[PDB]
Amino acid sequence: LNGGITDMLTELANFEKNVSQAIHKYNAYRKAASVIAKYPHKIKSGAEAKKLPGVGTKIAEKIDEFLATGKLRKLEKIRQDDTSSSINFLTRVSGIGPSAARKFVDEGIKTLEDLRKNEDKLNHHQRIGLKYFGDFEKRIPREEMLQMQDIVLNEVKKVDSEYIATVCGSFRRGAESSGDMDVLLTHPSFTSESPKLLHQVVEQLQKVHFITDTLSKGETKFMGVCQLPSKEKEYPHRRIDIRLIPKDQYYCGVLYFTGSGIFNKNMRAHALEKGFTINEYTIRPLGVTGVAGEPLPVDSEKDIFDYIQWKYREPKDRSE
Template identity: 55%
Template sequence: MSKRKAPKSEKNEDIVEALIELAEYEKNVERNRFKEKAYRKAATIIAGLDKRIKSGDDAKALPGVGDKIAKKIDEILETGKLRKLENIRADDKSTAINLLTRVSGIGPAKAKELVDAGIINLDDLEKHKDKLNHAQLIGLKHFHDFEVKIPREEVKELFESVKKVADSIDEEYMMEVCGSFRRGAKFSGDVDILLCHSEFKHSDKHHGDLLHRLIKKLTEKELVTDKISEGDTKFMGVAKLPKHKHFRRLDVRLLPVDEYYCGLLYFTGSNIFNTEMRAHAHQKRFILNEHSLRPLECGKPGAPLPVSSEQDIFEYLDYPYKKPEDRD
């Protein structure tokens, strides 16, 4: 997945970008996941507004916006900037950690380790490749390409190319692009494909070579250029279309056919929508996750319910159906 996905808002873009930057700081430097989640939730809610926020009090009427975030919004509205962010940007260590975590495969702990060793920029990383693992080396190799957002049409083209290869192997493959793309985003940070096969069910002990044979063929066709990791059910790597100049992050996840639609719902997102739907399921005495929908029986999850579409899940839960583009 892309490491930095900021929601967009034409009306409140300055506020949204500031909150996302604060979230990145809390995640990468302070390692405070609670504050990170709070900033991201507020940013997502504000990004969905179709009108300009006029004050912090105005923002506090929104879910996920408390006093502290409201005060920061007031400061942005009144001064056009945020003192806390200026202090963060002026701190060399914080800036270096935030930069290094943008390299795919480098998390906050590794970034701090590198900065503590005196490695503060990409040039330093190039000189100390011995400190990086395989995934991080690929992230460094393609850093500039991974920073470039993928236009929707290019995601479609890459997906269609992958699907064409899959169909040539076995027409029983089924797949779809998930994430923000499926929710209608104009640009994506990476391409996440959910894959299944009609003969692969949860009860099967072996996955066969369903994923491996697809990746093998994609590599032979030179669509896949680098492998970060490859297991029986998940591939992480790099892809490139012949007529395009940028290399792109590609993830392919294999699910059993009887888990496919719960997985499709979950991996489409958004995170806020998933949280709300799982909470609703619990109120209705169900357990919903990326694998299954189960009724709660005497406080314990029962057998998975048969699910043959996303709509089935909404109907079981008596939850109004929302199209993917309405799940932000």
């Protein structure tokens, strides 16, 4: 295994994102951690690791130091830095990003209690993130996701039989647990060339006391909180997103939001090699000089695989 290395790299990633405000270093560290986590041998040297794409000179050196000492001095200094620790912690609140965390810590607001004492300094999203701080960090067992899917699919049908709703994310690929629930919604009345379609669904889910809180809500995206009904101890509150997509872009959306991200990458690269470009909304043909044509008609995920002459992959086999 290599859990020591990947943990180190993930801790560095979070430092770069939250304290340094260096999103590309965060992603570099994450990329390195992901390739190493997938590698099938306990790494013995930085040089060994550097053969992996995304591992370069600096991470190789850190791996050598970790392997020889069991720690990383850089990290030890970071862990001991009270300001970096406080900023890092605060960003665990949903809605508190690196900018708000630093600002809070600058004026002595460092702990959950400080936030609770200063709730007037929080915006709506941040107040909800604080409210469900522990709940949002729990994962969702598939059994509960299954029960949540039932409620969402049933309530959407009650509003209008011609809504189509798909629960995507790792759950759709068959994951044993999920971090949140991602619902993609469409309706034949809503296309690229074409009121309250999302609102009526959100409202119905509120009226049945499934949706408990709203982080943000517009005409095409809802971000909020939900909870399964209990008999017993109550269930944790869960993040749920519902995205309203035009029907002619729906299956491209289902494809994208199902992932995995690695899978999307490889599928887009294969599409190109066949003269097509796929993004979150459309698949378009590429001309001989590389000009994208008009979007192609898509009535199913399968249609997309067909265009690029790929055998349809079950969502279950889309980890890569």
